[PDB]
């Protein structure tokens, strides 16, 4: 047992590689996306820098679990980070609904990883992932939920135009 | 009863009033050790500046308790802050060994309060033991465990040199 | 066929996503040795530093290969990023010894990819990996050289003196 | 024989006077398309302004020759410079598909003259055409392949509307 350790069940610790693993995925995914809009048949600049961020941004979220992993006093175990779904991602709204699904599968992780800390009773756990993670995923929800509701209207992903200007005005 | 006084249990303002004595006395632990570095015989200045320090934030989270007992409309009672358990605290590895000791002592009656605090339906000390209080204490257990590490890795408490290369390259 | 393809063999695009998905691994790889030296049991925090800094460099070196595949008409194909081959790298001088490995297994596959493209007179691709990827790898790989000569000489890893003064002074 | 002549092939200076050739033409088509965007009846000043832009960086390529051919000891021999193949280039798409055209025409060029000093050991007049001319044409080529896609997307030629706003949100 770590010198450190207090309050922290062995469930906690693996469910937190778990989750180290699936935000590690979800960087893969959006690194995925970027490249996709760097297509010289794609050319969308700003959606594929939009996604490289979000990628960059996962990788702090996996990096700040391990760093939670080890002080409270839990070993870090690493798995194979999986291959995106997709090798081509179809539009702009396509890669957008894509990554909205992403999201909520982390969300519905991370509600399940807060279950857990919970009827452990570890308020430690509990404060991480509110304070750190919840709400950074609901707004993440809302912000790709507003972009794919305004390229639906725009006429996407018909509309190469609808993209086009969405990549200028929203993503620029 | 307070007029300011909503969803605060008198169980919950006892456990209070024991917290605020439990930080009073890690704040007289921690000056003892300080000046324990401070003797011509242990001469580590800088173990005994870390202390002080420490001493010092005990006294602030000691305040910040009895000033959410007076936020809350609770009566703070105070009572004897018990001497240490040591005079001689015999090496800086062994005072790190009592201090991360005592942080651990500290942080499960904070966990204690938080079970208390959820039982009895009282989210607003939930917050704010979560808030100020319990990611406080895995840092300093962290810290302190690193610490005790590094010391044993050196060789200390054997090693004077170890103890002597730790005061100047760790806590300098 | 993209419409910016020219003079980029098949052979040379599949050998590019390969060497994308070799440098990802490496990124992981020093993902883990980086949170082994943050462990409470370990607390070398300079060596987590230096294995993190490491980490992000190889996410780089990836992206600028996915940014070639696109620049020169190749598509992107991702695949699984296999776990390192340790979860405990045991030491400072162990860690950089396999770094030291991994640097120059990366290496000779960047040497394979340029026999390739020497192979298939492209001369961009020869120019890119010259440019950007074989002094990177040769500095790289000088650097871990000197570290590992040091820590050996220093007396690690039975010295756990040698490391922390060399985390202290070397890596600080 | 000029006194610095040294490993410089007769068949490397004539290939270099016959780049020079074609970078002086590569300038007057660009010229050419940039005063066709300034017609009262296209009045695209981003498009026209785009091409300028293009002409007079040919020019420093043809310059650059020019100083390398005298670095060698080589000897400048100016042949005449063609007019462009059209005088109307129809729309913003066409000319920049017929940029892309011309970008990859420069490109197979200078990989003939690096096939040429390749096979004549030449390894500083191998360096001279990597540095500063291959990876120019890769980036050029990239670029009218994203802005041939995009336009294409957004409904051009047929779109006056794609066209106009292509010029104010890519090329202004
Ligand atoms: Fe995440
Ligand atoms: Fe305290
Ligand atoms: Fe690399
Ligand atoms: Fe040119
Ligand atoms: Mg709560
Ligand atoms: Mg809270």
Not at 24 to 43: C, E, N, T
Not at 105 to 134: G, M, R
Request: glycine share 4%; hydrophobic share 35%.
């Amino acid at each position: 047992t770590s010198q450190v350790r207090q309050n922290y069940h062995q469930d906690s610790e693996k469910a937190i590689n778990r989750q180290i693993r699936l935000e590690l995925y979800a960087s893969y995914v959006y690194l995925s996306m970027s490249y996709y809009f760097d297509r010289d048949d794609v050319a969308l600049k700003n959606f594929a820098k939009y996604f490289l961020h979000q990628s960059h941004e996962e990788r702090e979220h996996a990096e700040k679990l391990m760093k939670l992993q080890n002080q409270r006093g839990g070993r870090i175990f690493l798995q194979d980070i999986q291959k995106p779904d997709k090798d081509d991602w179809e539009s702009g709204l396509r890669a957008m609904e894509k990554a909205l699904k992403l999201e909520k599968k982390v969300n519905q992780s991370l509600l399940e990883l807060h279950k857990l800390a919970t009827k452990k009773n570890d308020p430690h756990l509990c404060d991480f992932i509110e304070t750190h993670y919840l709400n950074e995923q609901v707004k993440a929800i809302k912000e790709l939920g507003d972009h794919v509701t305004n390229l639906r209207k725009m006429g996407a992903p018909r509309s190469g135009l609808a993209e086009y200007l969405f990549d200028k005005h929203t993503l620029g």
